[PDB]
Amino acid sequence: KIPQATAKRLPLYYRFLKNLHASGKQRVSSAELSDAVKVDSATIRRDFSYFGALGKGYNVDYLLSFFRKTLDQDEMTDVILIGVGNLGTAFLHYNFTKNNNTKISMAFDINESKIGTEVGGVPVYNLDDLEQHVKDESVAILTVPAVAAQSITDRLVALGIKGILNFTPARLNVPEHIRIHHIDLAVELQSLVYFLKHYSVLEE
Amino acid sequence: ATAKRLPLYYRFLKNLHASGKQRVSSAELSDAVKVDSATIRRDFSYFGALGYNVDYLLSFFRKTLDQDDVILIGVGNLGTAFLHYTKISMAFDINESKIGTEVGGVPVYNLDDLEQHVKDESVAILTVPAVAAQSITDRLVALGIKGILNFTPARLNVPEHIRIHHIDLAVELQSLVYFLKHYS
C-alpha cells in the first residue's frame, strides 16, 4: 500500500532502535521487534518488505540508520519552484537552516537557457516535463509573470500540490482544500507606504 | 513647513473622531500638538476650513495625502526583481559595476553616499545579505526613514515607531507547512 498500520509502526521501530543502539546492542531479532511494537513476527516480516529493509536477526546499526533515513524522507518538505527569473533565482540561492527540513528540490522554467541549468545546486527543468518529475512534493513557489500563473496552478493541483506560495500579482482560483499564501510584493510595498500616511492598514 | 504640521493635525484628529467629537478649537489643538493656535488658524484657512468641523479636516487631510519617495538598497536578484516589478527613486549598492548605472529606470549610487542623497524619503527596501542588514538599518533610522521593507532573514533592531515589513521565504514556508501537517 503501504498500509496505514504499517506506516504508523515506522516511528515506533525507530524509537525502539535508538534505545537499543544507545544501550550497546548489536543484534535484534523479529521476536524482540515484535515485543517492542506489540505485534507478531509475521507482521515484522510483512512491514519490513513494505519498508525495503534487509535482514537474516537484524543488525541494530543498519536498521537504525535505515529507519532514520526513511523517517527523514517521510518528514522532509520538498518544495518546487516554477519560474527561474530574478525572484526565482534568489530563492534558489536561499540558505535554509539545518534544523529546518525544508528545501527546494527542483525548479521549472520555459527559457531554453534556464532549462538544463543548476541554480544554487537545484536542477531547472523544462516546464513541459512538470508531470514526469512531480510525485510526492506538496508545496510550490510561483514566481512567473501573472499571465502564466493560473494554467500552471491548474496543473500543480492536478499533480497533488496542496500548498502554494504565490509571489505573482495574479489572484489564483483553486479548490477549497488548497492553501494559498499570496505575497504580492508591489502590494506589500504600497501597504507600508499607506500605513505611514494614514496609520491604518491598506485594503486588501 | 505647512505639510509637516498636517500629519500632526491628522493623527490627533483621527484620535478625536474615534471619541465622537466633531468640533475642535485652535486652543484645543494647540494644547494637544504643541503648535501655537495662531499658526493653526493660519493653516486651517489654507485647508479651506471654516471651532472647526473635525470631519471636514480629516477628509481633507486624507485626500491631500492620497493626492501627492522609496529607496532601495541591494540591487541583486531580489532588488532587481523589485525594480521590475508607488515609485522607487534611488537604489544603493557596493558593487562598482552597478554603481553609476540604471536598473529599471532607477539610478544606482554608492552606499557611502546614502547620507548625502537621502533627504525626504521615508521608506527603504532592504534586499542585501542578512550580514549587511543591521548596520544599514542603523544608518537609515539615523537618516529618519519611517518604514523598512525587510526582504532579508535578519531580525532588525529598530525603535518601536519604525514600521518593519518582514518578507522571508523560510518564515513564510514554515507557516504554510504547519497548516498542511496539522489541518489537512
Side-chain angles (χ1 to χ4, degrees):
Chain A
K1 270 163 271 173
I2 297 169
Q4 263 186 289
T6 296
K8 297 182 202 214
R9 275 157 214 145
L10 170 72
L12 274 65
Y13 290 126
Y14 182 66
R15 286 173 246 166
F16 177 55
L17 277 137
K18 291 171 68 189
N19 180 258
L20 247 30
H21 184 265
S23 75
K25 239 68 204 320
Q26 296 173 59
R27 286 264 133 179
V28 62
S29 67
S30 283
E32 301 175 81
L33 284 156
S34 297
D35 288 340
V37 316
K38 309 279 169 287
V39 292
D40 57 29
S41 289
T43 299
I44 298 315
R45 172 182 78 230
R46 289 191 308 271
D47 284 3
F48 281 24
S49 279
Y50 282 120
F51 298 138
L54 329 167
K56 197 146 84 154
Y58 297 96
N59 179 96
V60 161
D61 172 276
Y62 160 81
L63 271 200
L64 177 68
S65 298
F66 186 83
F67 284 143
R68 187 39 157 178
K69 179 188 60 144
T70 309
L71 269 167
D72 285 353
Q73 274 170 350
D74 296 10
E75 303 180 324
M76 164 80 51
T77 298
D78 281 339
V79 180
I80 343 158
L81 183 130
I82 319 277
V84 185
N86 289 309
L87 200 65
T89 117
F91 290 164
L92 302 178
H93 289 106
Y94 200 90
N95 308 261
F96 294 107
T97 61
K98 210 178 179 180
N99 207 244
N100 191 13
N101 37 65
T102 305
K103 75 184 168 211
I104 303 162
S105 51
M106 50 181 73
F108 298 84
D109 208 273
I110 58 160
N111 178 347
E112 309 177 321
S113 300
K114 303 303 190 188
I115 307 158
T117 198
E118 209 131 292
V119 172
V122 14
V124 180
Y125 298 128
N126 192 330
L127 177 69
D128 279 13
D129 290 319
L130 206 248
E131 283 75 30
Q132 274 64 60
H133 285 104
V134 180
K135 261 71 206 143
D136 49 320
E137 298 79 10
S138 194
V139 172
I141 297 161
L142 207 47
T143 54
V144 294
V147 58
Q150 187 58 58
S151 311
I152 289 165
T153 302
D154 294 346
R155 286 160 78 184
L156 292 174
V157 304
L159 288 155
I161 285 326
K162 295 304 152 191
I164 295 166
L165 297 188
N166 177 29
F167 292 85
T168 88
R171 312 141 178 191
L172 301 182
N173 303 328
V174 292
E176 58 200 299
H177 71 287
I178 313 280
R179 199 68 172 185
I180 317 290
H181 289 201
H182 190 174
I183 305 107
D184 183 327
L185 304 180
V187 176
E188 309 293 81
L189 174 59
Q190 80 204 220
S191 297
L192 180 53
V193 159
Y194 194 85
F195 188 85
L196 313 166
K197 277 182 184 286
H198 304 295
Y199 294 109
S200 62
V201 173
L202 168 64
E203 297 275 359
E204 332 173 359
Chain B
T2 169
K4 285 177 207 161
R5 274 172 316 253
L6 185 158
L8 263 57
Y9 306 139
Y10 194 22
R11 203 104 127 99
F12 170 84
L13 287 206
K14 283 183 73 257
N15 297 26
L16 218 148
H17 187 284
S19 144
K21 301 173 168 185
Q22 43 233 2
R23 303 206 72 76
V24 64
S25 70
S26 30
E28 274 182 326
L29 197 36
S30 174
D31 176 60
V33 302
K34 303 151 196 84
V35 173
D36 68 318
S37 74
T39 298
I40 292 174
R41 290 199 184 167
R42 238 189 305 273
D43 294 351
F44 279 26
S45 213
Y46 188 69
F47 306 145
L50 272 152
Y52 292 102
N53 184 303
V54 173
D55 277 22
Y56 175 86
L57 289 153
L58 278 180
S59 207
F60 181 87
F61 300 147
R62 183 177 170 181
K63 176 54 85 175
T64 309
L65 282 153
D66 287 336
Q67 284 171 154
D68 262 40
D69 185 16
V70 176
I71 72 184
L72 175 137
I73 311 171
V75 185
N77 286 117
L78 222 51
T80 306
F82 247 104
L83 305 173
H84 264 155
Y85 274 114
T86 317
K87 289 197 210 166
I88 300 158
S89 61
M90 290 173 263
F92 297 90
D93 210 282
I94 67 172
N95 185 343
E96 290 166 14
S97 264
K98 288 176 180 169
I99 294 162
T101 75
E102 206 152 78
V103 179
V106 185
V108 176
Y109 308 104
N110 192 318
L111 188 70
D112 291 340
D113 303 340
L114 189 69
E115 285 78 8
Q116 65 204 85
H117 302 153
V118 177
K119 285 168 86 79
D120 20 65
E121 29 285 304
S122 288
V123 182
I125 301 152
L126 199 51
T127 53
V128 291
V131 71
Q134 187 53 63
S135 154
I136 295 156
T137 293
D138 287 2
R139 295 165 63 179
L140 284 177
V141 314
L143 263 36
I145 263 57
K146 296 315 163 221
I148 302 178
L149 201 162
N150 185 23
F151 205 163
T152 83
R155 310 306 265 112
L156 301 179
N157 300 138
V158 288
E160 203 188 329
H161 62 272
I162 309 289
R163 181 165 184 98
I164 309 296
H165 184 67
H166 188 218
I167 311 187
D168 185 74
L169 196 59
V171 166
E172 201 68 45
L173 280 159
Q174 192 179 138
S175 184
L176 176 72
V177 170
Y178 188 99
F179 180 94
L180 299 172
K181 284 184 168 279
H182 293 83
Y183 309 99
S184 310

